[PDB]
């Protein structure tokens, strides 16, 4: 985090500057994603329940390994509303970005 089941988030990660999305992950937690520029994605969190955790992965299907992920990062989600920024270039060859709650 820098200063400002599994859902498909490619629309924002691989989108243009200005690309936005919102996902209700459970009854308590909603995550907004906003691509602020070519280098940075902003994550917005609203959590009306207990602390949880957001896990971000990027998936590939390779001939040798089949469906496998690279862990990008994982982030505490405390009660209330907040934000943090991630350094992810949109011009990446990495596709199939996902996020999920730990619990």
Place of tokens 């949109």: 90
The window from 8-16, 34-42, 43-51, 75-83 that contacts Ni ion (CB under 5 A) reads 8-16
Phi, psi dihedrals of residue 18, rounded to the nearest 5° = 105, -20
C-beta atoms surrounding 103 within 10 Å? 9
Which residue from 1, 11, 22, 26 is in contact with Ni ion, where contact means CB under 5 A? 26
Which among 5, 6, 99, 88 has a CA at the least distance from the CA of 56? 99
Q: In terms of CB distance, is 4 or 51 closer to Ni ion?
A: 51
Both structure tokens of 3: 């200063």
Is 101 a residue that touches Ni ion (CB under 5 A)?
yes
Query: Rounded to an integer, what distance in angstroms lies between the CA atom of residue 97 and that of residue 60?
Result: 9
Q: In terms of CB distance, is 54 or 101 closer to Ni ion?
A: 101
The window from 16-24, 31-39, 74-82, 93-101 that contacts Ni ion (CB under 5 A) reads 93-101
Q: Which residues bind Ni ion (CB under 5 A)?
A: 8, 10, 26, 96, 101
């Amino acid at each position: 985090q820098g200063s400002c089941g599994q859902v498909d988030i490619d629309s924002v990660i691989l989108g243009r500057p200005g690309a936005i999305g919102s996902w209700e992950l459970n009854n308590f937690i909603t995550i907004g994603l906003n691509r602020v520029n070519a280098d940075t994605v902003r994550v917005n969190i609203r959590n009306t329940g207990r602390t949880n955790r957001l896990i971000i992965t990027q998936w590939d299907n390779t001939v040798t390994r089949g469906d496998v992920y690279e862990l990008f990062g994982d982030y505490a989600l405390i009660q209330g509303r907040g934000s943090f920024c991630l350094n992810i270039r949109s011009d990446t060859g990495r596709e199939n970005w996902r996020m999920q709650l730990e619990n």
